[PDB]
Amino acid sequence: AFRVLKPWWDVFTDYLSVAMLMIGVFGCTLQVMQDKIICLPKRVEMKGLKTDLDLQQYSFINQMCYERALHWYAKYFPYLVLIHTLVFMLCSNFWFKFPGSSSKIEHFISILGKCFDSPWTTRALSEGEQAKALFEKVKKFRLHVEEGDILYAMYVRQTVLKVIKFLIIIAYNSALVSKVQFTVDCNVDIQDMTGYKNFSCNHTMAHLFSKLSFCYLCFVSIYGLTCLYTLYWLFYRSLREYSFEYVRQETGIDDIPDVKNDFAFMLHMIDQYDPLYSKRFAVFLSEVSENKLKQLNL
Protein backbone atom coordinates (compact mmCIF):
# COMPACT_ATOMS: atom_id res chain seq x y z
CA ALA A 1 0.00 0.00 0.00
CA PHE A 2 2.95 2.30 -0.77
CA ARG A 3 3.74 2.30 2.96
CA VAL A 4 7.53 2.08 2.64
CA LEU A 5 8.24 5.23 0.56
CA LYS A 6 7.41 8.11 2.91
CA PRO A 7 10.38 10.02 4.40
CA TRP A 8 9.83 12.82 6.92
CA TRP A 9 9.96 15.25 3.99
CA ASP A 10 6.91 13.68 2.36
CA VAL A 11 4.72 13.58 5.47
CA PHE A 12 5.69 17.13 6.47
CA THR A 13 4.96 18.44 2.97
CA ASP A 14 1.63 16.61 2.91
CA TYR A 15 0.69 18.14 6.27
CA LEU A 16 1.56 21.61 4.97
CA SER A 17 -0.46 20.89 1.83
CA VAL A 18 -3.55 19.84 3.79
CA ALA A 19 -3.19 22.92 5.99
CA MET A 20 -3.08 25.06 2.85
CA LEU A 21 -6.11 23.24 1.45
CA MET A 22 -8.14 23.79 4.62
CA ILE A 23 -7.23 27.49 4.86
CA GLY A 24 -8.09 28.01 1.19
CA VAL A 25 -11.40 26.16 1.39
CA PHE A 26 -12.31 28.06 4.57
CA GLY A 27 -11.59 31.32 2.77
CA CYS A 28 -13.62 30.29 -0.28
CA THR A 29 -16.65 28.88 1.54
CA LEU A 30 -16.93 31.92 3.81
CA GLN A 31 -16.86 34.15 0.73
CA VAL A 32 -20.47 33.83 -0.50
CA MET A 33 -22.26 34.37 2.83
CA GLN A 34 -20.99 37.90 3.59
CA ASP A 35 -19.33 39.77 0.71
CA LYS A 36 -20.75 43.05 -0.58
CA ILE A 37 -19.34 46.26 -2.02
CA ILE A 38 -21.76 48.72 -0.40
CA CYS A 39 -21.27 52.11 -2.06
CA LEU A 40 -22.62 55.61 -1.45
CA PRO A 41 -22.35 58.78 -3.54
CA LYS A 42 -19.69 61.26 -2.50
CA ARG A 43 -20.64 64.93 -2.65
CA VAL A 44 -17.43 66.70 -3.67
CA GLU A 45 -28.06 71.13 13.59
CA MET A 46 -26.99 67.83 12.02
CA LYS A 47 -29.64 66.33 9.74
CA GLY A 48 -29.87 63.34 7.46
CA LEU A 49 -28.75 63.60 3.84
CA LYS A 50 -31.11 62.39 1.11
CA THR A 51 -29.54 60.84 -1.98
CA ASP A 52 -32.87 60.45 -3.85
CA LEU A 53 -31.83 57.11 -5.38
CA ASP A 54 -34.16 54.20 -6.09
CA LEU A 55 -33.66 50.65 -4.78
CA GLN A 56 -32.13 49.48 -8.07
CA GLN A 57 -29.71 52.35 -8.70
CA TYR A 58 -27.88 51.07 -5.62
CA SER A 59 -27.59 47.49 -6.90
CA PHE A 60 -26.44 48.96 -10.22
CA ILE A 61 -23.83 51.08 -8.46
CA ASN A 62 -22.65 48.19 -6.29
CA GLN A 63 -22.04 45.81 -9.16
CA MET A 64 -20.60 48.55 -11.38
CA CYS A 65 -18.04 49.54 -8.74
CA TYR A 66 -17.28 45.89 -7.93
CA GLU A 67 -15.44 45.66 -11.26
CA ARG A 68 -14.05 49.18 -11.77
CA ALA A 69 -12.44 49.90 -8.38
CA LEU A 70 -11.28 46.57 -6.89
CA HIS A 71 -7.97 44.92 -7.73
CA TRP A 72 -8.22 41.43 -9.19
CA TYR A 73 -6.29 40.06 -6.20
CA ALA A 74 -8.95 41.13 -3.69
CA LYS A 75 -11.62 39.04 -5.45
CA TYR A 76 -9.81 35.82 -6.45
CA PHE A 77 -7.29 35.08 -3.66
CA PRO A 78 -9.08 31.90 -2.47
CA TYR A 79 -9.18 30.60 -6.05
CA LEU A 80 -5.44 31.21 -6.45
CA VAL A 81 -4.63 29.38 -3.23
CA LEU A 82 -6.86 26.39 -4.04
CA ILE A 83 -5.40 26.08 -7.53
CA HIS A 84 -1.80 26.31 -6.34
CA THR A 85 -2.30 23.87 -3.47
CA LEU A 86 -3.91 21.38 -5.87
CA VAL A 87 -0.94 21.80 -8.21
CA PHE A 88 1.41 21.12 -5.29
CA MET A 89 -0.56 18.01 -4.34
CA LEU A 90 -0.40 16.65 -7.89
CA CYS A 91 3.31 17.50 -8.03
CA SER A 92 4.16 15.56 -4.87
CA ASN A 93 2.30 12.45 -5.94
CA PHE A 94 3.88 11.93 -9.38
CA TRP A 95 7.27 10.21 -9.03
CA PHE A 96 6.08 6.93 -7.52
CA LYS A 97 2.91 6.93 -9.64
CA PHE A 98 3.03 7.34 -13.42
CA PRO A 99 2.53 4.97 -16.36
CA GLY A 100 5.02 2.12 -16.53
CA SER A 101 5.91 2.29 -12.82
CA SER A 102 2.80 1.39 -10.79
CA SER A 103 3.15 -2.35 -11.41
CA LYS A 104 6.69 -2.62 -10.03
CA ILE A 105 5.89 -1.55 -6.46
CA GLU A 106 2.84 -3.84 -6.25
CA HIS A 107 5.14 -6.86 -5.88
CA PHE A 108 8.67 -5.52 -5.27
CA ILE A 109 7.59 -4.46 -1.78
CA SER A 110 6.11 -7.91 -1.12
CA ILE A 111 9.37 -9.51 -2.27
CA LEU A 112 11.31 -7.24 0.08
CA GLY A 113 8.94 -8.09 2.92
CA LYS A 114 9.34 -11.84 2.50
CA CYS A 115 13.08 -11.15 2.29
CA PHE A 116 12.90 -9.36 5.66
CA ASP A 117 10.99 -12.07 7.55
CA SER A 118 13.04 -15.05 6.34
CA PRO A 119 14.63 -16.75 9.39
CA TRP A 120 17.47 -18.21 7.30
CA THR A 121 19.28 -14.86 7.53
CA THR A 122 20.32 -15.64 11.11
CA ARG A 123 21.82 -18.98 10.05
CA ALA A 124 23.51 -17.30 7.07
CA LEU A 125 25.14 -14.78 9.42
CA SER A 126 26.97 -17.69 11.10
CA GLU A 127 15.76 -24.60 0.95
CA GLY A 128 18.33 -24.70 -1.85
CA GLU A 129 15.79 -24.29 -4.64
CA GLN A 130 14.01 -21.42 -2.87
CA ALA A 131 17.27 -19.54 -2.32
CA LYS A 132 18.30 -20.17 -5.93
CA ALA A 133 14.98 -18.82 -7.20
CA LEU A 134 15.27 -15.77 -4.95
CA PHE A 135 18.83 -15.09 -6.13
CA GLU A 136 18.01 -15.45 -9.83
CA LYS A 137 14.98 -13.18 -9.41
CA VAL A 138 17.19 -10.66 -7.61
CA LYS A 139 19.72 -10.81 -10.46
CA LYS A 140 16.97 -10.31 -13.04
CA PHE A 141 15.60 -7.34 -11.09
CA ARG A 142 19.09 -5.83 -10.79
CA LEU A 143 19.68 -6.16 -14.53
CA HIS A 144 16.23 -4.66 -15.20
CA VAL A 145 16.89 -1.66 -12.95
CA GLU A 146 20.33 -0.76 -14.30
CA GLU A 147 19.12 -0.77 -17.93
CA GLY A 148 16.55 2.02 -17.49
CA ASP A 149 17.42 5.59 -18.45
CA ILE A 150 15.37 8.81 -18.37
CA LEU A 151 14.99 8.56 -14.58
CA TYR A 152 17.12 11.37 -13.11
CA ALA A 153 15.77 14.15 -15.34
CA MET A 154 12.15 13.53 -14.32
CA TYR A 155 12.79 13.38 -10.56
CA VAL A 156 15.36 16.18 -10.43
CA ARG A 157 12.78 18.24 -12.33
CA GLN A 158 10.18 17.51 -9.64
CA THR A 159 11.79 19.17 -6.61
CA VAL A 160 13.02 22.11 -8.69
CA LEU A 161 9.46 22.47 -9.99
CA LYS A 162 8.34 22.92 -6.39
CA VAL A 163 11.25 25.32 -5.82
CA ILE A 164 10.44 27.52 -8.82
CA LYS A 165 6.76 27.41 -7.82
CA PHE A 166 7.81 28.67 -4.38
CA LEU A 167 9.84 31.45 -5.96
CA ILE A 168 7.01 32.69 -8.18
CA ILE A 169 4.37 32.32 -5.45
CA ILE A 170 6.33 34.32 -2.88
CA ALA A 171 7.25 36.82 -5.59
CA TYR A 172 3.75 37.78 -6.64
CA ASN A 173 2.20 37.34 -3.19
CA SER A 174 4.72 39.76 -1.68
CA ALA A 175 4.66 42.24 -4.57
CA LEU A 176 0.90 42.79 -4.87
CA VAL A 177 -0.47 42.38 -1.36
CA SER A 178 -0.95 46.01 -0.25
CA LYS A 179 -3.90 46.29 -2.67
CA VAL A 180 -6.45 44.69 -0.33
CA GLN A 181 -7.39 47.90 1.48
CA PHE A 182 -10.80 48.41 3.08
CA THR A 183 -12.02 51.73 1.58
CA VAL A 184 -11.47 52.21 -2.14
CA ASP A 185 -12.61 55.06 -4.39
CA CYS A 186 -14.81 54.34 -7.41
CA ASN A 187 -15.07 57.06 -10.06
CA VAL A 188 -17.22 55.64 -12.86
CA ASP A 189 -18.87 58.03 -15.33
CA ILE A 190 -22.51 56.90 -15.04
CA GLN A 191 -23.93 60.43 -14.95
CA ASP A 192 -27.23 60.40 -16.85
CA MET A 193 -28.46 57.07 -15.51
CA THR A 194 -27.93 57.68 -11.77
CA GLY A 195 -26.86 61.30 -11.31
CA TYR A 196 -23.57 61.04 -9.42
CA LYS A 197 -20.13 60.66 -10.99
CA ASN A 198 -17.95 59.95 -7.92
CA PHE A 199 -18.54 57.36 -5.21
CA SER A 200 -16.90 55.77 -2.17
CA CYS A 201 -16.86 51.99 -1.77
CA ASN A 202 -15.55 49.68 0.95
CA HIS A 203 -15.05 45.93 0.56
CA THR A 204 -16.58 43.96 3.43
CA MET A 205 -13.90 41.26 3.77
CA ALA A 206 -10.57 43.03 3.38
CA HIS A 207 -8.93 42.56 6.77
CA LEU A 208 -9.75 38.85 7.01
CA PHE A 209 -8.38 38.38 3.50
CA SER A 210 -5.19 40.14 4.58
CA LYS A 211 -4.83 37.83 7.59
CA LEU A 212 -5.42 34.76 5.41
CA SER A 213 -2.82 36.03 2.94
CA PHE A 214 -0.27 36.40 5.73
CA CYS A 215 -0.99 32.90 7.03
CA TYR A 216 -0.67 31.44 3.53
CA LEU A 217 2.62 33.30 3.10
CA CYS A 218 3.94 31.74 6.31
CA PHE A 219 2.89 28.25 5.23
CA VAL A 220 4.45 28.73 1.79
CA SER A 221 7.67 29.92 3.45
CA ILE A 222 7.89 26.82 5.64
CA TYR A 223 7.10 24.57 2.66
CA GLY A 224 9.82 26.26 0.60
CA LEU A 225 12.33 25.89 3.43
CA THR A 226 11.55 22.17 3.50
CA CYS A 227 12.08 21.97 -0.26
CA LEU A 228 15.35 23.91 0.01
CA TYR A 229 16.63 21.49 2.65
CA THR A 230 15.61 18.62 0.36
CA LEU A 231 17.68 20.13 -2.45
CA TYR A 232 20.60 20.73 -0.09
CA TRP A 233 20.54 17.05 0.87
CA LEU A 234 20.30 15.97 -2.77
CA PHE A 235 23.09 18.24 -4.05
CA TYR A 236 25.62 18.85 -1.27
CA ARG A 237 26.76 15.22 -0.96
CA SER A 238 26.67 13.01 -4.04
CA LEU A 239 24.11 10.25 -3.50
CA ARG A 240 25.34 7.94 -6.29
CA GLU A 241 28.03 6.07 -4.32
CA TYR A 242 28.01 3.91 -1.20
CA SER A 243 30.78 3.35 1.35
CA PHE A 244 30.98 -0.19 2.78
CA GLU A 245 33.53 0.62 5.47
CA TYR A 246 31.75 -1.00 8.43
CA VAL A 247 31.23 -4.40 6.79
CA ARG A 248 34.93 -5.14 6.29
CA GLN A 249 35.50 -4.19 9.94
CA GLU A 250 32.66 -6.08 11.66
CA THR A 251 32.27 -9.10 9.33
CA GLY A 252 35.46 -9.34 7.26
CA ILE A 253 33.73 -9.53 3.86
CA ASP A 254 35.86 -7.06 1.87
CA ASP A 255 34.62 -7.73 -1.67
CA ILE A 256 31.14 -6.14 -1.65
CA PRO A 257 30.81 -3.79 -4.66
CA ASP A 258 29.46 -0.26 -4.32
CA VAL A 259 26.65 0.42 -6.78
CA LYS A 260 26.44 3.76 -8.60
CA ASN A 261 23.97 5.87 -10.61
CA ASP A 262 20.22 5.48 -10.09
CA PHE A 263 20.35 2.30 -8.00
CA ALA A 264 22.79 3.92 -5.57
CA PHE A 265 20.41 6.85 -5.14
CA MET A 266 17.49 4.50 -4.46
CA LEU A 267 19.52 2.60 -1.87
CA HIS A 268 20.67 5.79 -0.15
CA MET A 269 17.13 7.19 -0.05
CA ILE A 270 15.95 3.93 1.51
CA ASP A 271 18.69 4.41 4.13
CA GLN A 272 16.76 7.23 5.85
CA TYR A 273 13.68 5.12 6.69
CA ASP A 274 15.12 1.93 8.24
CA PRO A 275 18.90 1.16 8.20
CA LEU A 276 18.26 -2.60 8.34
CA TYR A 277 16.89 -3.66 4.93
CA SER A 278 20.34 -2.99 3.45
CA LYS A 279 21.91 -5.79 5.48
CA ARG A 280 19.11 -8.18 4.51
CA PHE A 281 19.71 -7.35 0.84
CA ALA A 282 23.48 -7.78 1.27
CA VAL A 283 22.95 -11.23 2.80
CA PHE A 284 21.57 -12.31 -0.59
CA LEU A 285 24.59 -10.81 -2.36
CA SER A 286 27.56 -12.64 -0.79
CA GLU A 287 28.92 -15.64 -2.68
CA VAL A 288 30.03 -17.51 0.45
CA SER A 289 26.41 -18.25 1.36
CA GLU A 290 25.79 -19.75 -2.08
CA ASN A 291 28.96 -21.84 -1.83
CA LYS A 292 27.87 -23.16 1.56
CA LEU A 293 24.40 -23.93 0.19
CA LYS A 294 25.90 -25.77 -2.79
CA GLN A 295 28.11 -27.83 -0.49
CA LEU A 296 25.13 -28.65 1.74
CA ASN A 297 23.15 -29.76 -1.32
CA LEU A 298 25.68 -32.50 -2.13
- Helix 261-270 with 128-146: angle, nearest 10 deg: 120
Q: Footprint of its own copies on residues 31-90 (CB under 8 A)?
A: 32-36, 38, 40-60, 63-64, 67, 76
Give the nearer residue to its own copies in terms of CB position, either 103 or 295. Answer: 103
Q: Is 194 in the site for its own copies (CB under 8 A)?
A: yes
State which of residues 206, 222, 231, 293 lies at the interface with its own copies (CB under 8 A).
206
Q: Applying CB under 8 A, which of residues 103, 243, 249, 295 lies at the interface with its own copies?
A: 103
In DSSP notation, the chain reads ---S---HHHHHHHHHHHHHHHHHHHHHHTTSSS----EEE-------------SSHHHHHHHHHTTTSS-THHHHHHHHHHHHHHHHHHHTTSTTSSTTTHHHHHHHHHHHHHHHS-THHHHHH--HHHHHHHHHHHHHHHHHHHT--S-HHHHHHHHHHHHHHHHHHHHHHHHS-S---S-EEE----TTTTS-S-EEE--SSSHHHHHHHHHHHHHHHHHHHHHHHHHHHHHHS--S-----SHHHHT---------HHHHHHHHHHTTT-TTHHHHHHHTT-HHHHHHHHHHH-
Provide, rounded to whole angstroms, the least separation between the CB of residue 115 and its own copies.
Answer: 15
195 binding its own copies? (CB under 8 A):
yes
- Compute the least distance from the CB of residue 230 to its own copies, in Å: 14
Binding segment toward its own copies, per CB under 8 A, in 92-100, 165-173, 261-269, 287-295: 92-100
Q: Decide if residue 296 touches its own copies (CB under 8 A).
A: no
C-beta closer to its own copies: residue 47 or 237? 47
Count CA atoms closer than 13 A to 226's CA, side-chain side.
19
Is the CB of 207 or the CB of 292 nearer to its own copies? Answer: 207
Task: Work out the angle at residue 136's Cα, subtended by the Cα atoms of residues 131 and 137, and round it to the nearest 5 degrees.
Answer: 95
Query: Contact at 8 Å (CB) between 57 and 132?
Result: no
189 binds its own copies (CB under 8 A): no
Work out which of 110, 187, 272, 297 binds its own copies, going by CB under 8 A. 272
Measured from the CB atom, is 98 or 229 closer to its own copies? 98
Binding string to its own copies for residues 113 to 152, with x set by CB under 8 A, is what? ------x--x---x------x--xx--x---x--------
Min CB(257)–its own copies separation in Å: 19
Q: Is 197 an interacting residue with respect to its own copies (CB under 8 A)?
A: yes
Task: Give residues in contact with its own copies (CB under 8 A).
Answer: 3, 6-8, 11, 30, 32-36, 38, 40-60, 63-64, 67, 76, 97-100, 103-104, 119, 122, 126, 133, 136-137, 140, 144, 182-183, 192-197, 200, 202, 204, 206-207, 211, 272-274, 276
